[PDB]
Amino acid sequence: SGDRTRELKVIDYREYDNTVYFILRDGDKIYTIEVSPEEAKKLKPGDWVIVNEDGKLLHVQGSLEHHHHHH
């Protein structure tokens, strides 16, 4: 159970007037997604993303610290 979303690494992009193609990597698998330029403004090669069920790009921001047990 769990492990239902997939994080992908941006390895490349191709930019045209009205569309940006991102090349995304999950392990040894490659996916392509095409978005509008305003959706690509914050993403570059080396960034990580999650694409949700609606096709929305979600930007991986990092981890949150948890150094202390709280129960």
PDB file of N, CA, C and O in Angstrom:
ATOM      1  N   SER A   1       0.833  -1.200   0.000  1.00  0.00           N
ATOM      2  CA  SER A   1       0.000   0.000   0.000  1.00  0.00           C
ATOM      3  C   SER A   1       0.873   1.258   0.000  1.00  0.00           C
ATOM      4  O   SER A   1       2.050   1.226   0.410  1.00  0.00           O
ATOM      5  N   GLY A   2       0.288   2.370  -0.447  1.00  0.00           N
ATOM      6  CA  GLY A   2       1.064   3.568  -0.650  1.00  0.00           C
ATOM      7  C   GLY A   2       1.934   3.428  -1.893  1.00  0.00           C
ATOM      8  O   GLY A   2       1.782   2.515  -2.715  1.00  0.00           O
ATOM      9  N   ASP A   3       2.871   4.366  -2.014  1.00  0.00           N
ATOM     10  CA  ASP A   3       3.809   4.401  -3.141  1.00  0.00           C
ATOM     11  C   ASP A   3       3.071   4.548  -4.471  1.00  0.00           C
ATOM     12  O   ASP A   3       3.396   3.886  -5.463  1.00  0.00           O
ATOM     13  N   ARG A   4       2.060   5.417  -4.492  1.00  0.00           N
ATOM     14  CA  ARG A   4       1.184   5.526  -5.649  1.00  0.00           C
ATOM     15  C   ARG A   4       1.550   6.674  -6.575  1.00  0.00           C
ATOM     16  O   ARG A   4       1.116   6.676  -7.735  1.00  0.00           O
ATOM     17  N   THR A   5       2.320   7.645  -6.096  1.00  0.00           N
ATOM     18  CA  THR A   5       2.803   8.725  -6.941  1.00  0.00           C
ATOM     19  C   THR A   5       4.243   8.452  -7.356  1.00  0.00           C
ATOM     20  O   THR A   5       4.973   7.689  -6.717  1.00  0.00           O
ATOM     21  N   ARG A   6       4.646   9.103  -8.440  1.00  0.00           N
ATOM     22  CA  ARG A   6       5.957   8.909  -9.041  1.00  0.00           C
ATOM     23  C   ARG A   6       6.641  10.261  -9.146  1.00  0.00           C
ATOM     24  O   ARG A   6       6.080  11.201  -9.717  1.00  0.00           O
ATOM     25  N   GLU A   7       7.831  10.366  -8.565  1.00  0.00           N
ATOM     26  CA  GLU A   7       8.659  11.548  -8.736  1.00  0.00           C
ATOM     27  C   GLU A   7       9.546  11.366  -9.960  1.00  0.00           C
ATOM     28  O   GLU A   7      10.116  10.292 -10.176  1.00  0.00           O
ATOM     29  N   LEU A   8       9.656  12.422 -10.760  1.00  0.00           N
ATOM     30  CA  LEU A   8      10.415  12.391 -11.999  1.00  0.00           C
ATOM     31  C   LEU A   8      11.438  13.509 -12.004  1.00  0.00           C
ATOM     32  O   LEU A   8      11.205  14.582 -11.444  1.00  0.00           O
ATOM     33  N   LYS A   9      12.569  13.249 -12.648  1.00  0.00           N
ATOM     34  CA  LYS A   9      13.627  14.234 -12.787  1.00  0.00           C
ATOM     35  C   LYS A   9      13.553  14.832 -14.183  1.00  0.00           C
ATOM     36  O   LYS A   9      13.484  14.100 -15.173  1.00  0.00           O
ATOM     37  N   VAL A  10      13.583  16.156 -14.255  1.00  0.00           N
ATOM     38  CA  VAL A  10      13.695  16.858 -15.527  1.00  0.00           C
ATOM     39  C   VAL A  10      15.130  16.700 -16.015  1.00  0.00           C
ATOM     40  O   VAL A  10      16.070  17.156 -15.356  1.00  0.00           O
ATOM     41  N   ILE A  11      15.306  16.038 -17.159  1.00  0.00           N
ATOM     42  CA  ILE A  11      16.641  15.896 -17.736  1.00  0.00           C
ATOM     43  C   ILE A  11      16.863  16.780 -18.964  1.00  0.00           C
ATOM     44  O   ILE A  11      18.027  16.982 -19.351  1.00  0.00           O
ATOM     45  N   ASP A  12      15.814  17.334 -19.562  1.00  0.00           N
ATOM     46  CA  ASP A  12      15.941  18.107 -20.788  1.00  0.00           C
ATOM     47  C   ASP A  12      14.614  18.790 -21.067  1.00  0.00           C
ATOM     48  O   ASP A  12      13.583  18.437 -20.487  1.00  0.00           O
ATOM     49  N   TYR A  13      14.661  19.797 -21.931  1.00  0.00           N
ATOM     50  CA  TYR A  13      13.456  20.487 -22.366  1.00  0.00           C
ATOM     51  C   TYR A  13      13.680  20.996 -23.784  1.00  0.00           C
ATOM     52  O   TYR A  13      14.815  21.169 -24.226  1.00  0.00           O
ATOM     53  N   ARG A  14      12.578  21.217 -24.497  1.00  0.00           N
ATOM     54  CA  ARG A  14      12.583  21.842 -25.815  1.00  0.00           C
ATOM     55  C   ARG A  14      11.528  22.932 -25.801  1.00  0.00           C
ATOM     56  O   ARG A  14      10.366  22.659 -25.487  1.00  0.00           O
ATOM     57  N   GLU A  15      11.920  24.157 -26.135  1.00  0.00           N
ATOM     58  CA  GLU A  15      11.034  25.303 -26.020  1.00  0.00           C
ATOM     59  C   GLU A  15      10.729  25.897 -27.384  1.00  0.00           C
ATOM     60  O   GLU A  15      11.634  26.187 -28.170  1.00  0.00           O
ATOM     61  N   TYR A  16       9.447  26.086 -27.641  1.00  0.00           N
ATOM     62  CA  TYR A  16       8.910  26.685 -28.847  1.00  0.00           C
ATOM     63  C   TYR A  16       8.096  27.916 -28.443  1.00  0.00           C
ATOM     64  O   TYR A  16       8.027  28.292 -27.268  1.00  0.00           O
ATOM     65  N   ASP A  17       7.491  28.564 -29.437  1.00  0.00           N
ATOM     66  CA  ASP A  17       6.785  29.812 -29.173  1.00  0.00           C
ATOM     67  C   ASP A  17       5.725  29.625 -28.103  1.00  0.00           C
ATOM     68  O   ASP A  17       5.611  30.434 -27.175  1.00  0.00           O
ATOM     69  N   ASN A  18       4.940  28.550 -28.208  1.00  0.00           N
ATOM     70  CA  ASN A  18       3.747  28.411 -27.382  1.00  0.00           C
ATOM     71  C   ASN A  18       3.674  27.081 -26.649  1.00  0.00           C
ATOM     72  O   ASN A  18       2.599  26.700 -26.161  1.00  0.00           O
ATOM     73  N   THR A  19       4.793  26.379 -26.542  1.00  0.00           N
ATOM     74  CA  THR A  19       4.774  25.070 -25.917  1.00  0.00           C
ATOM     75  C   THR A  19       6.191  24.729 -25.482  1.00  0.00           C
ATOM     76  O   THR A  19       7.167  25.139 -26.116  1.00  0.00           O
ATOM     77  N   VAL A  20       6.288  24.000 -24.375  1.00  0.00           N
ATOM     78  CA  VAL A  20       7.552  23.494 -23.862  1.00  0.00           C
ATOM     79  C   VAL A  20       7.394  21.998 -23.656  1.00  0.00           C
ATOM     80  O   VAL A  20       6.432  21.556 -23.020  1.00  0.00           O
ATOM     81  N   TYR A  21       8.313  21.222 -24.215  1.00  0.00           N
ATOM     82  CA  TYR A  21       8.370  19.789 -23.968  1.00  0.00           C
ATOM     83  C   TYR A  21       9.392  19.530 -22.874  1.00  0.00           C
ATOM     84  O   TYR A  21      10.544  19.949 -22.995  1.00  0.00           O
ATOM     85  N   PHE A  22       8.973  18.854 -21.808  1.00  0.00           N
ATOM     86  CA  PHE A  22       9.895  18.401 -20.776  1.00  0.00           C
ATOM     87  C   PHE A  22      10.164  16.915 -20.976  1.00  0.00           C
ATOM     88  O   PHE A  22       9.239  16.138 -21.227  1.00  0.00           O
ATOM     89  N   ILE A  23      11.428  16.523 -20.837  1.00  0.00           N
ATOM     90  CA  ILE A  23      11.836  15.123 -20.834  1.00  0.00           C
ATOM     91  C   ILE A  23      12.079  14.741 -19.382  1.00  0.00           C
ATOM     92  O   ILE A  23      12.965  15.302 -18.728  1.00  0.00           O
ATOM     93  N   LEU A  24      11.320  13.766 -18.896  1.00  0.00           N
ATOM     94  CA  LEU A  24      11.282  13.404 -17.488  1.00  0.00           C
ATOM     95  C   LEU A  24      11.743  11.966 -17.313  1.00  0.00           C
ATOM     96  O   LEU A  24      11.409  11.090 -18.116  1.00  0.00           O
ATOM     97  N   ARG A  25      12.475  11.713 -16.239  1.00  0.00           N
ATOM     98  CA  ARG A  25      13.077  10.410 -16.017  1.00  0.00           C
ATOM     99  C   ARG A  25      12.616   9.822 -14.692  1.00  0.00           C
ATOM    100  O   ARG A  25      12.674  10.491 -13.655  1.00  0.00           O
ATOM    101  N   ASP A  26      12.164   8.572 -14.738  1.00  0.00           N
ATOM    102  CA  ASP A  26      11.873   7.772 -13.551  1.00  0.00           C
ATOM    103  C   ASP A  26      12.705   6.496 -13.642  1.00  0.00           C
ATOM    104  O   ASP A  26      12.333   5.550 -14.344  1.00  0.00           O
ATOM    105  N   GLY A  27      13.836   6.468 -12.948  1.00  0.00           N
ATOM    106  CA  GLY A  27      14.675   5.291 -12.997  1.00  0.00           C
ATOM    107  C   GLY A  27      15.254   5.115 -14.390  1.00  0.00           C
ATOM    108  O   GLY A  27      15.966   5.995 -14.885  1.00  0.00           O
ATOM    109  N   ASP A  28      14.984   3.983 -15.045  1.00  0.00           N
ATOM    110  CA  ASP A  28      15.440   3.781 -16.420  1.00  0.00           C
ATOM    111  C   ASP A  28      14.327   4.024 -17.445  1.00  0.00           C
ATOM    112  O   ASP A  28      14.405   3.541 -18.585  1.00  0.00           O
ATOM    113  N   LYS A  29      13.316   4.810 -17.073  1.00  0.00           N
ATOM    114  CA  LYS A  29      12.193   5.133 -17.944  1.00  0.00           C
ATOM    115  C   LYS A  29      12.122   6.632 -18.209  1.00  0.00           C
ATOM    116  O   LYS A  29      12.402   7.450 -17.323  1.00  0.00           O
ATOM    117  N   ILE A  30      11.734   6.973 -19.439  1.00  0.00           N
ATOM    118  CA  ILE A  30      11.657   8.352 -19.914  1.00  0.00           C
ATOM    119  C   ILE A  30      10.215   8.654 -20.287  1.00  0.00           C
ATOM    120  O   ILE A  30       9.581   7.864 -20.992  1.00  0.00           O
ATOM    121  N   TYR A  31       9.703   9.807 -19.840  1.00  0.00           N
ATOM    122  CA  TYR A  31       8.402  10.301 -20.267  1.00  0.00           C
ATOM    123  C   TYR A  31       8.551  11.707 -20.819  1.00  0.00           C
ATOM    124  O   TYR A  31       9.437  12.464 -20.417  1.00  0.00           O
ATOM    125  N   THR A  32       7.669  12.041 -21.749  1.00  0.00           N
ATOM    126  CA  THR A  32       7.590  13.370 -22.326  1.00  0.00           C
ATOM    127  C   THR A  32       6.251  13.984 -21.951  1.00  0.00           C
ATOM    128  O   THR A  32       5.210  13.317 -21.984  1.00  0.00           O
ATOM    129  N   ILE A  33       6.282  15.256 -21.585  1.00  0.00           N
ATOM    130  CA  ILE A  33       5.065  16.010 -21.324  1.00  0.00           C
ATOM    131  C   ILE A  33       5.228  17.386 -21.952  1.00  0.00           C
ATOM    132  O   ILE A  33       6.327  17.946 -21.985  1.00  0.00           O
ATOM    133  N   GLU A  34       4.132  17.907 -22.483  1.00  0.00           N
ATOM    134  CA  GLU A  34       4.089  19.177 -23.184  1.00  0.00           C
ATOM    135  C   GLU A  34       3.180  20.106 -22.396  1.00  0.00           C
ATOM    136  O   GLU A  34       2.028  19.760 -22.111  1.00  0.00           O
ATOM    137  N   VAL A  35       3.703  21.267 -22.025  1.00  0.00           N
ATOM    138  CA  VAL A  35       2.966  22.228 -21.226  1.00  0.00           C
ATOM    139  C   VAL A  35       3.116  23.600 -21.858  1.00  0.00           C
ATOM    140  O   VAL A  35       3.893  23.808 -22.794  1.00  0.00           O
ATOM    141  N   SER A  36       2.338  24.535 -21.339  1.00  0.00           N
ATOM    142  CA  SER A  36       2.430  25.913 -21.778  1.00  0.00           C
ATOM    143  C   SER A  36       3.661  26.568 -21.153  1.00  0.00           C
ATOM    144  O   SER A  36       4.118  26.169 -20.075  1.00  0.00           O
ATOM    145  N   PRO A  37       4.227  27.581 -21.811  1.00  0.00           N
ATOM    146  CA  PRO A  37       5.434  28.216 -21.254  1.00  0.00           C
ATOM    147  C   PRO A  37       5.248  28.755 -19.847  1.00  0.00           C
ATOM    148  O   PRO A  37       6.163  28.646 -19.023  1.00  0.00           O
ATOM    149  N   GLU A  38       4.074  29.298 -19.521  1.00  0.00           N
ATOM    150  CA  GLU A  38       3.867  29.816 -18.170  1.00  0.00           C
ATOM    151  C   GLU A  38       3.893  28.705 -17.121  1.00  0.00           C
ATOM    152  O   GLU A  38       4.166  28.979 -15.946  1.00  0.00           O
ATOM    153  N   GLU A  39       3.651  27.456 -17.522  1.00  0.00           N
ATOM    154  CA  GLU A  39       3.764  26.331 -16.604  1.00  0.00           C
ATOM    155  C   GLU A  39       5.198  25.835 -16.482  1.00  0.00           C
ATOM    156  O   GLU A  39       5.497  25.051 -15.579  1.00  0.00           O
ATOM    157  N   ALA A  40       6.088  26.261 -17.375  1.00  0.00           N
ATOM    158  CA  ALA A  40       7.481  25.823 -17.363  1.00  0.00           C
ATOM    159  C   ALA A  40       8.427  26.835 -16.723  1.00  0.00           C
ATOM    160  O   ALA A  40       9.633  26.566 -16.617  1.00  0.00           O
ATOM    161  N   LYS A  41       7.906  27.971 -16.263  1.00  0.00           N
ATOM    162  CA  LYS A  41       8.768  29.090 -15.900  1.00  0.00           C
ATOM    163  C   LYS A  41       9.672  28.765 -14.716  1.00  0.00           C
ATOM    164  O   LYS A  41      10.720  29.399 -14.544  1.00  0.00           O
ATOM    165  N   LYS A  42       9.248  27.857 -13.842  1.00  0.00           N
ATOM    166  CA  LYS A  42       9.947  27.612 -12.587  1.00  0.00           C
ATOM    167  C   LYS A  42      10.747  26.316 -12.605  1.00  0.00           C
ATOM    168  O   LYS A  42      11.302  25.922 -11.570  1.00  0.00           O
ATOM    169  N   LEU A  43      10.825  25.648 -13.754  1.00  0.00           N
ATOM    170  CA  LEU A  43      11.412  24.322 -13.852  1.00  0.00           C
ATOM    171  C   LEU A  43      12.565  24.315 -14.844  1.00  0.00           C
ATOM    172  O   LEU A  43      12.461  24.876 -15.941  1.00  0.00           O
ATOM    173  N   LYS A  44      13.663  23.655 -14.460  1.00  0.00           N
ATOM    174  CA  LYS A  44      14.783  23.503 -15.379  1.00  0.00           C
ATOM    175  C   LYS A  44      15.416  22.130 -15.197  1.00  0.00           C
ATOM    176  O   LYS A  44      15.143  21.447 -14.199  1.00  0.00           O
ATOM    177  N   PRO A  45      16.279  21.700 -16.122  1.00  0.00           N
ATOM    178  CA  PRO A  45      16.954  20.409 -15.952  1.00  0.00           C
ATOM    179  C   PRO A  45      17.571  20.291 -14.565  1.00  0.00           C
ATOM    180  O   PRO A  45      18.177  21.231 -14.050  1.00  0.00           O
ATOM    181  N   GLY A  46      17.397  19.124 -13.956  1.00  0.00           N
ATOM    182  CA  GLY A  46      17.857  18.868 -12.611  1.00  0.00           C
ATOM    183  C   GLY A  46      16.783  18.978 -11.548  1.00  0.00           C
ATOM    184  O   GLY A  46      16.968  18.449 -10.444  1.00  0.00           O
ATOM    185  N   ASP A  47      15.679  19.654 -11.848  1.00  0.00           N
ATOM    186  CA  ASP A  47      14.555  19.745 -10.934  1.00  0.00           C
ATOM    187  C   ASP A  47      13.759  18.444 -10.948  1.00  0.00           C
ATOM    188  O   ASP A  47      13.756  17.699 -11.929  1.00  0.00           O
ATOM    189  N   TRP A  48      13.053  18.188  -9.854  1.00  0.00           N
ATOM    190  CA  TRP A  48      12.188  17.027  -9.719  1.00  0.00           C
ATOM    191  C   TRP A  48      10.734  17.475  -9.676  1.00  0.00           C
ATOM    192  O   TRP A  48      10.407  18.566  -9.186  1.00  0.00           O
ATOM    193  N   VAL A  49       9.853  16.617 -10.177  1.00  0.00           N
ATOM    194  CA  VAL A  49       8.440  16.947 -10.282  1.00  0.00           C
ATOM    195  C   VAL A  49       7.590  15.710 -10.022  1.00  0.00           C
ATOM    196  O   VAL A  49       8.041  14.567 -10.144  1.00  0.00           O
ATOM    197  N   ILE A  50       6.324  15.969  -9.698  1.00  0.00           N
ATOM    198  CA  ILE A  50       5.257  14.977  -9.718  1.00  0.00           C
ATOM    199  C   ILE A  50       4.197  15.503 -10.672  1.00  0.00           C
ATOM    200  O   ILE A  50       3.802  16.668 -10.576  1.00  0.00           O
ATOM    201  N   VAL A  51       3.761  14.662 -11.607  1.00  0.00           N
ATOM    202  CA  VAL A  51       2.632  14.969 -12.479  1.00  0.00           C
ATOM    203  C   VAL A  51       1.412  14.279 -11.897  1.00  0.00           C
ATOM    204  O   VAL A  51       1.417  13.054 -11.735  1.00  0.00           O
ATOM    205  N   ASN A  52       0.371  15.047 -11.569  1.00  0.00           N
ATOM    206  CA  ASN A  52      -0.779  14.452 -10.906  1.00  0.00           C
ATOM    207  C   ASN A  52      -1.801  13.958 -11.928  1.00  0.00           C
ATOM    208  O   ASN A  52      -1.597  14.032 -13.140  1.00  0.00           O
ATOM    209  N   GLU A  53      -2.920  13.431 -11.421  1.00  0.00           N
ATOM    210  CA  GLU A  53      -3.882  12.758 -12.286  1.00  0.00           C
ATOM    211  C   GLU A  53      -4.441  13.688 -13.354  1.00  0.00           C
ATOM    212  O   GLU A  53      -4.856  13.226 -14.424  1.00  0.00           O
ATOM    213  N   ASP A  54      -4.464  14.989 -13.087  1.00  0.00           N
ATOM    214  CA  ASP A  54      -4.993  15.979 -14.015  1.00  0.00           C
ATOM    215  C   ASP A  54      -3.933  16.526 -14.960  1.00  0.00           C
ATOM    216  O   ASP A  54      -4.233  17.425 -15.755  1.00  0.00           O
ATOM    217  N   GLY A  55      -2.708  16.018 -14.886  1.00  0.00           N
ATOM    218  CA  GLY A  55      -1.642  16.519 -15.722  1.00  0.00           C
ATOM    219  C   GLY A  55      -0.932  17.733 -15.175  1.00  0.00           C
ATOM    220  O   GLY A  55      -0.182  18.377 -15.915  1.00  0.00           O
ATOM    221  N   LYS A  56      -1.183  18.096 -13.919  1.00  0.00           N
ATOM    222  CA  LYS A  56      -0.568  19.278 -13.332  1.00  0.00           C
ATOM    223  C   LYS A  56       0.851  18.966 -12.878  1.00  0.00           C
ATOM    224  O   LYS A  56       1.108  17.922 -12.271  1.00  0.00           O
ATOM    225  N   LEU A  57       1.769  19.872 -13.180  1.00  0.00           N
ATOM    226  CA  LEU A  57       3.143  19.758 -12.714  1.00  0.00           C
ATOM    227  C   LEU A  57       3.248  20.257 -11.276  1.00  0.00           C
ATOM    228  O   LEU A  57       2.886  21.402 -10.984  1.00  0.00           O
ATOM    229  N   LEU A  58       3.718  19.394 -10.377  1.00  0.00           N
ATOM    230  CA  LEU A  58       3.946  19.740  -8.979  1.00  0.00           C
ATOM    231  C   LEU A  58       5.444  19.738  -8.709  1.00  0.00           C
ATOM    232  O   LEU A  58       6.120  18.735  -8.962  1.00  0.00           O
ATOM    233  N   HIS A  59       5.953  20.853  -8.184  1.00  0.00           N
ATOM    234  CA  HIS A  59       7.390  21.082  -8.073  1.00  0.00           C
ATOM    235  C   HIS A  59       7.913  20.537  -6.753  1.00  0.00           C
ATOM    236  O   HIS A  59       7.477  20.982  -5.687  1.00  0.00           O
ATOM    237  N   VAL A  60       8.875  19.616  -6.821  1.00  0.00           N
ATOM    238  CA  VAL A  60       9.473  19.075  -5.604  1.00  0.00           C
ATOM    239  C   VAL A  60      10.385  20.133  -4.996  1.00  0.00           C
ATOM    240  O   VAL A  60      11.355  20.575  -5.623  1.00  0.00           O
ATOM    241  N   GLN A  61      10.076  20.526  -3.756  1.00  0.00           N
ATOM    242  CA  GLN A  61      10.757  21.622  -3.078  1.00  0.00           C
ATOM    243  C   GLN A  61      11.834  21.162  -2.104  1.00  0.00           C
ATOM    244  O   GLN A  61      12.707  21.959  -1.747  1.00  0.00           O
ATOM    245  N   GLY A  62      11.781  19.926  -1.649  1.00  0.00           N
ATOM    246  CA  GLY A  62      12.749  19.383  -0.730  1.00  0.00           C
ATOM    247  C   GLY A  62      12.059  18.694   0.422  1.00  0.00           C
ATOM    248  O   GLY A  62      10.840  18.491   0.428  1.00  0.00           O
ATOM    249  N   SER A  63      12.852  18.331   1.416  1.00  0.00           N
ATOM    250  CA  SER A  63      12.379  17.602   2.577  1.00  0.00           C
ATOM    251  C   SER A  63      12.238  18.541   3.763  1.00  0.00           C
ATOM    252  O   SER A  63      12.848  19.610   3.810  1.00  0.00           O
ATOM    253  N   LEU A  64      11.380  18.149   4.692  1.00  0.00           N
ATOM    254  CA  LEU A  64      11.176  18.870   5.937  1.00  0.00           C
ATOM    255  C   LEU A  64      11.862  18.114   7.068  1.00  0.00           C
ATOM    256  O   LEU A  64      11.784  16.883   7.137  1.00  0.00           O
ATOM    257  N   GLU A  65      12.558  18.855   7.931  1.00  0.00           N
ATOM    258  CA  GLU A  65      13.328  18.243   9.010  1.00  0.00           C
ATOM    259  C   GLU A  65      12.410  17.657  10.080  1.00  0.00           C
ATOM    260  O   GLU A  65      11.405  18.268  10.460  1.00  0.00           O
ATOM    261  N   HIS A  66      12.779  16.456  10.598  1.00  0.00           N
ATOM    262  CA  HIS A  66      12.022  15.798  11.677  1.00  0.00           C
ATOM    263  C   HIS A  66      13.035  15.134  12.613  1.00  0.00           C
ATOM    264  O   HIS A  66      13.267  13.924  12.567  1.00  0.00           O
ATOM    265  N   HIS A  67      13.644  15.944  13.476  1.00  0.00           N
ATOM    266  CA  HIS A  67      14.725  15.491  14.339  1.00  0.00           C
ATOM    267  C   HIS A  67      14.249  15.071  15.716  1.00  0.00           C
ATOM    268  O   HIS A  67      15.064  14.611  16.523  1.00  0.00           O
ATOM    269  N   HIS A  68      12.960  15.222  16.004  1.00  0.00           N
ATOM    270  CA  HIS A  68      12.442  14.990  17.343  1.00  0.00           C
ATOM    271  C   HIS A  68      11.148  14.197  17.275  1.00  0.00           C
ATOM    272  O   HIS A  68      10.239  14.536  16.509  1.00  0.00           O
ATOM    273  N   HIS A  69      11.092  13.139  18.079  1.00  0.00           N
ATOM    274  CA  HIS A  69       9.935  12.260  18.164  1.00  0.00           C
ATOM    275  C   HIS A  69       8.795  12.973  18.878  1.00  0.00           C
ATOM    276  O   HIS A  69       8.991  13.556  19.948  1.00  0.00           O
ATOM    277  N   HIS A  70       7.594  12.919  18.294  1.00  0.00           N
ATOM    278  CA  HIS A  70       6.427  13.621  18.832  1.00  0.00           C
ATOM    279  C   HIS A  70       5.208  12.682  18.893  1.00  0.00           C
ATOM    280  O   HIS A  70       4.257  12.830  18.121  1.00  0.00           O
ATOM    281  N   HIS A  71       5.223  11.740  19.832  1.00  0.00           N
ATOM    282  CA  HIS A  71       4.034  10.949  20.161  1.00  0.00           C
ATOM    283  C   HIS A  71       4.062  10.620  21.653  1.00  0.00           C
ATOM    284  O   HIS A  71       3.174  10.993  22.416  1.00  0.00           O
TER     285      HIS A  71
END
